[PDB]
Amino acid sequence: MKKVIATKVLGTVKWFNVRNGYGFINRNDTKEDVFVHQTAIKKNNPRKYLRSVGDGETVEFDVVEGEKGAEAANVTGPG
Numbered sequence: 001m002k003k004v005i006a007t008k009v010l011g012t013v014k015w016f017n018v019r020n021g022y023g024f025i026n027r028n029d030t031k032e033d034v035f036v037h038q039t040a041i042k043k044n045n046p047r048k049y050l051r052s053v054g055d056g057e058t059v060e061f062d063v064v065e066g067e068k069g070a071e072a073a074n075v076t077g078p079g
Contacts, residue, residue, distance in 0.1 A: 003065045004064045005027075005065075006062065006063050009060065011028045012028070025072060034066075034072050035071050036061065042074070059075060060075070
């Protein structure tokens with residue numbers, strides 16, 4: 001397609017680096033690189049609690065035209 005892929009997209013978040021505040025998503029259809037930053041995440045995320053999901057959590061995001069490929073906007077979380 002021309003520019004961005006979509007809004008409201010599901011996929012698997014991996015390797016979130018908290019210290020800088022960046023991670024990446026494995027965008028499902030043809031395994032595409034979606035970079036995601038802390039400022040795109042909605043609401044507030046506190047700094048507590050253990051058990052939510054684990055590794056490979058599912059999150060909603062827009063897959064939106066980045067630099068080389070894609071980034072992520074309107075990003076949610078499991079709860």
